[PDB]
Design a protein around this ligand. Structure first.
Ligand code: TZD
Ligand code: TZD
Ligand code: TZD
Ligand code: CA
Ligand code: CA
Ligand code: CA
Ligand code: CA
Ligand code: CA
Ligand code: CA
Ligand code: CA
Ligand code: CA
Ligand code: CA
Ligand code: MG
Lengths: 524, 524, 524
């Protein structure tokens, strides 16, 4: 067998059947003779390739496979890898290298010092020393991406390797099963359970690795047993809990002092599947108030090490959540009462308040919709206004890197064809990965894109005001016609200048057979 | 003085007056109080920011200053940095970092291990250890980008540094002059000149660093004195010689055997300002035929080290070209005779042959036009069909990384407001950095964009045929309306479906007061 | 031809005839069939291997070739590479890698991520992608080490590569000549010369790259023409000027304020072949006083970039020194007058003052002796008390890293068999690379080692007093018998407890046919 044939066999035996890519000359020897059981998903720029694969992996809860061109293609994707690192996304990033005979002279298309290029945004990065090593290196990539804490990996392959003879002993790679589905030993788990059972006023904080593990329902059981309020950790990349469950208390503010004040009075705070904590604004103060003890369960040693307070347990979130849910006592405390709905913002017959948009989406969208957020100034309101009952219902750029949601929404929709995806994207954010629209059109992936057009980088204007920073350039983005951009890439386009038009456009979009973009005129 | 005030003073004293950027929260404390003598050029995605700055630096022959957001913004620009490295572009890339008090906890927006992120695509990469070090680090960045061999550099700055007190002794940085304008010592230069004077059949090969140095006219003098044919080194990022001068022989093919056959019979081959050589295709054979000696003059130790043959001299290309032009004897050989014009391809009243497009551009464009090429399957024909008399007339992605020419053409046009820029971009290539169009519209930078629309990644279809590679996915890009994309970003748009319409559209474009995009229907 | 045969041919054609090494299993396929025209110099630990090669390269003014074992052997040498980086030493460091078939499984002896291991202490670091690339990679290593600014490089080679067939076209590598012997263009050089001719009170500061270039005599001519005092830049790794010439003013103190005060009143300060400046102690103040302009000539862009003041020229030091010496006017100012000899320290019949030791060495040693210094508390006195008329007469660990002088003195003595080498090494410093003594014994390299035994890390006790730092552990090193260590490794040993015994021991050492160690009891 050839390295080509052996590698595709390994991929299929390890559950991979889709290549997300943008091709180049070093990749043609890999992509030739493309197997009939595989699917290739083309995107027009590599940030879009990786974003689509990322959404697909996160929603599918399985690795996604990517093929990019050399250095320049890898480089175009490195902002997308920044988000993927922070979301623990299991991405297998391959890139083609020049033929081995031409690497030394640094022919055009040579990826110089290739394994260093994507660092520090990958768990493992490698170029094999020979063609017959390629299947083994691919095996390592698969497993490294997939083991807890999951994350992106990088493999560079000289193009001449594919046609070489493989080692027959590479067959031992095909069916390897590698597990990291581990939890705290019984004796120490019993100590933890006792501490939770003994707490007088526990709180729970959940992060994105809960949703990644599909631990949501176990966390519901845990919270009901402990009679405990539940917060989502700050800067949330995913939604780990039903947002209208009685215990839910919403998104934590991303500041040190704000979080310790919120937790004040809670004697035990159990954090599951989050960093401690993904703060954002500078908000100095106490990490915890006196009287509060924190215990973190994380899948990531790096998280456990850097937490400034609390104890930690490094384990698989699914296995831990299930064990805790099933082991804790049912408390005799009263169950928390559900938060009331938020205020209805007054809305005239002109430009839309973002709150109106979210309320209307929540009114009209199916109960199993999936939302993506890249409307950076409206996140707090979005989190209050969408009833998200089910797992896998929310994604937000995990490193704060714009250009995620537009492509990722396409990947999520591909992963979840029965669940309507609605991406809510600011007019600024929409440009970073605009060409991803084409993939939705060409593959008929029926994502709905809601562009919140206020003409400005609103979240930056807000931060500049918090800074009392004057005379800042570059904050306005006038003069973009998003209906014309959608037309450019083959996507049906609608405009909503007022609430009547928003409702009409959403009605049309929700019944369409293909992707749809709605440009919404929002308040400045 | 503050670090902010001291840093902007250093920048202005070192000739910097423009910031190419896409802002974020870590950069607002740098960008606030933006000096009135500086200009900010916004682009909507970081590949576009860096591409525009790159074109501006290359055309202006001076450093360009960039400000990007953290890790994600830097990451989005790394494909653009791949080209910048290969073109020796003097780019000062700054990125904002989290406040020092929040770096340890890895708050959102922290650039982890920041100095490693852009490697290996930068000459120098650094994060200062204190706020008062920032002006000095900026000084180092300026000089490192600007010294031969020029190239990109990276500086990460925690956002709290700007408001701190500067060291008063940073004033010594302001007026530092750093020169690398050096040439071979007289004794060894005399040996070289003797070897050139003694050659019976010399040839000259020129690369991009000639055009960067504005050494073109000295190279003309050299070639006329030596009575020598002149080739442009393969994979050419720039044009180093007048393309209708009698000595000009065109673009070398990017293959080992092809180049040694071309040089056969030339006893001395002098290469100036090029790698030896930027081969592309696999074309094995002899590096040089018996009888040919090669001498390379390069500004880059890395080039000199990796050449597989010949002697080398590492020196400034401007200083060396001038010294050689003025020192060599006038040979009594006959001057080379000019190449004839190429064939006129037969053209019906339907879709355009690329050759027709280039001939028409050459007919209609001003004699001081500047061309950019990202029409990857048509490069050889472009090189034969454009009469480029002047320096600075051609740019092509120096690493082969698509997404360069569209933004770079905007930067070149900003650098050279009297010279009409015409970017010839394939329909595939146009998507990588499509949002750069907006910057042309907003700043009214009157670049002309000629989109060669054949519906496919034509250069990849060609390579796949050379490979006899069948069943390759991802090679077709149907269904893009480039007039609608131009409308989306505010650029006047025209379509040319035949030669009559091409001429009419070019006539309109050449007289327009703003940027114009022409979508040309080219043969498949 | 094999890769083995081709590589040794390249080495010999490029002037390499000696391998400094400590062997291991991955290196046996390189070292087998060792050519009869090569010499292997074994040392017992890799810090010693590299130190010996470093001294040999620095004294010989040519590259030295090293072969180490994998990761562990490379790792043992990284402190030695720290010094080599700072001294611009042209060292070609090769290390053997596992066979390509075993690298993926990470068999014992695999050097993981090999090219990253010696960073940031090398100019270039690489592992070839195929066996036939090895000769080319070796070529690149040779040239990268040898081009200005010279420095160490690293090449990792899988052991199975050596027996493979080489590319016949590797013959083009054998006789490549690569020059970086460049100087400032005539127009700008004339500006510099005018500035020097016009100065009313010039000063010259010289660094180690002067001695490396053997530019010493040109600098003497320059100083005599300009009638200028001459200082050696701080933290001096080499001696660039005759220490009893009338212009010599000694070693500059390694502090910011101290140097600006020293230069006060000098209108133009010309620095040649030094960083600006290798300060050590914290001594805050002005970089330069008003009225002083600084101009630096450096072979290293990194030096030029980081200088906090002055103009800079990046060029070869030999070519620049010769051009300046020959171009400047003879000033009518009076020549500086020579410094008087230093004080004679009062010396009783007991333990030796270091000053006594240096005076006695200067009395007894040949005029062409070469000194190495690793007696860290006595450097200022050493610099005042040794008359060093000739180039190549002094070496000191250029990064301050102990373990250099003992092995380097062996390499220097091998490089300069007619010049008696005398290494003056503290009792603390002697231990770092003690096993290097064996190489002197086995090869009969007649270095004299003078161990200054005061029982303590004296320079650290001094710094702790400057800090008023009390209760510092680890500063005393009692209980070392250096005569017994010398016996252990086969070196003749003598003890000097007083001046009479010092003179007797030096008389014996200077007439010995082999290496000799003298343990001197020095004052505490
Ligand atoms: C790749 C990248 N570049 C720049 C930014 C900076 N950025 C920018 C540019 C923001 C404004 C986004 O504007 P929008 O129109 O999408 O939404 P709002 O108007 O609601 O803020 S929010 C912020 O973090 C970023 N995070 N990521
Ligand atoms: C960033 C990046 N991604 C992918 C490629 C691969 N690439 C691609 C995708 C080519 C086709 C470009 O198509 P085009 O329409 O712009 O021009 P032609 O049809 O004339 O080839 S040429 C080639 O090198 C690349 N070089 N750079
Ligand atoms: C490899 C290494 N380790 C530790 C040190 C620290 N070091 C030490 C340990 C010094 C004392 C050397 O003692 P000595 O006996 O050689 O000489 P003095 O007593 O004259 O200081 S000087 C100083 O920089 C160093 N520079 N290099
Ligand atoms: Ca409602
Ligand atoms: Ca699915
Ligand atoms: Ca907005
Ligand atoms: Ca014509
Ligand atoms: Ca200009
Ligand atoms: Ca095309
Ligand atoms: Ca004396
Ligand atoms: Ca010698
Ligand atoms: Ca001592
Ligand atoms: Mg990197």
């Amino acid at each position: 067998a050839s390295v080509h044939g052996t590698t595709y066999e390994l991929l299929r035996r390890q559950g991979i059947d889709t290549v997300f890519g943008n091709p180049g000359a070093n990749e043609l020897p890999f992509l030739k003779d493309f197997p009939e059981d595989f699917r290739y998903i083309l995107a027009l720029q590599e940030a879009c390739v990786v974003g689509i694969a990322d959404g697909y992996a996160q929603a599918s809860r399985k690795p996604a496979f990517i093929n990019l061109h050399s250095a320049a293609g890898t480089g175009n994707a490195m902002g997308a890898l920044s988000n993927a690192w922070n979301s623990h996304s299991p991405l297998i990033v391959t890139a083609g290298q020049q033929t081995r005979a031409m690497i030394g002279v640094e022919a055009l298309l040579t990826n110089v010092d290739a394994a260093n290029l994507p660092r520090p945004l990958v768990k493992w990065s490698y170029e094999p020393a020979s063609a017959a090593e390629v299947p083994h290196a691919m095996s390592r990539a698969i497993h490294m991406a997939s083991m807890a804490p999951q994350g992106p990996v990088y493999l560079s392959v000289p193009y001449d390797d594919w046609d070489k003879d493989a080692d027959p002993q590479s067959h031992h790679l095909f069916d390897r099963h590698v597990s990291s589905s581990v939890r705290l030993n019984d004796q120490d788990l019993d100590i933890l359970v006792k501490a939770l059972n003994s707490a007088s006023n526990p709180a729970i904080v959940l992060g994105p690795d809960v949703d990644a593990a599909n631990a949501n329902a176990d966390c519901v059981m845990l919270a009901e047993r402990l009679k405990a309020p539940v917060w989502v950790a700050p800067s949330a990349p995913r939604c780990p809990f039903p947002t209208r469950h009685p215990c839910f208390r919403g998104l934590m503010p991303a500041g040190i002092a704000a979080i310790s004040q919120l937790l004040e009075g809670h004697d035990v705070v159990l954090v599951i599947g989050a960093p401690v904590f993904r703060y954002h604004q500078y908000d100095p103060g106490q990490y915890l108030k006196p009287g509060t003890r924190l215990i973190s369960v994380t899948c990531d040693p790096l998280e456990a090490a850097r937490a400034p307070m609390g104890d930690a347990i490094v384990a698989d979130i699914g296995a831990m959540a299930s064990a805790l849910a099933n082991l804790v006592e049912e408390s005799s405390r009263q169950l928390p009462t559900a938060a009331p709905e938020p205020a209805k913002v007054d809305q005239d017959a002109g430009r839309l308040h973002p709150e109106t948009v979210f309320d209307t989406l929540n009114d009209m969208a199916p109960e199993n919709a999936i939302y993506l957020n890249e409307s950076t100034s409206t996140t707090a309101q979005m989190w209050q206004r969408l009833n998200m009952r089910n797992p896998g219902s929310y994604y937000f750029c995990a490193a704060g890197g714009l250009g995620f949601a537009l492509p990722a929404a396409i990947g999520v929709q591909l992963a979840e064809p029965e669940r309507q995806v609605i991406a809510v994207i600011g007019d600024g954010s929409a440009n970073y990965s605009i060409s991803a629209l084409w993939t939705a059109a060409q593959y008929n992936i029926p994502t709905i894109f809601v562009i919140m057009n206020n003409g400005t980088y609103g979240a930056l204007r807000w931060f500049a005001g918090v800074l009392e920073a004057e005379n800042v350039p570059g904050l306005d983005v006038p003069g973009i016609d998003f209906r014309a951009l959608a037309k450019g890439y083959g996507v049906q386009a609608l405009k909503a200048d007022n609430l009547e038009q928003l409702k009409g456009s959403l009605q049309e979009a929700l019944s369409a057979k293909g992707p749809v973009l709605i440009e919404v005129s929002t308040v400045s």
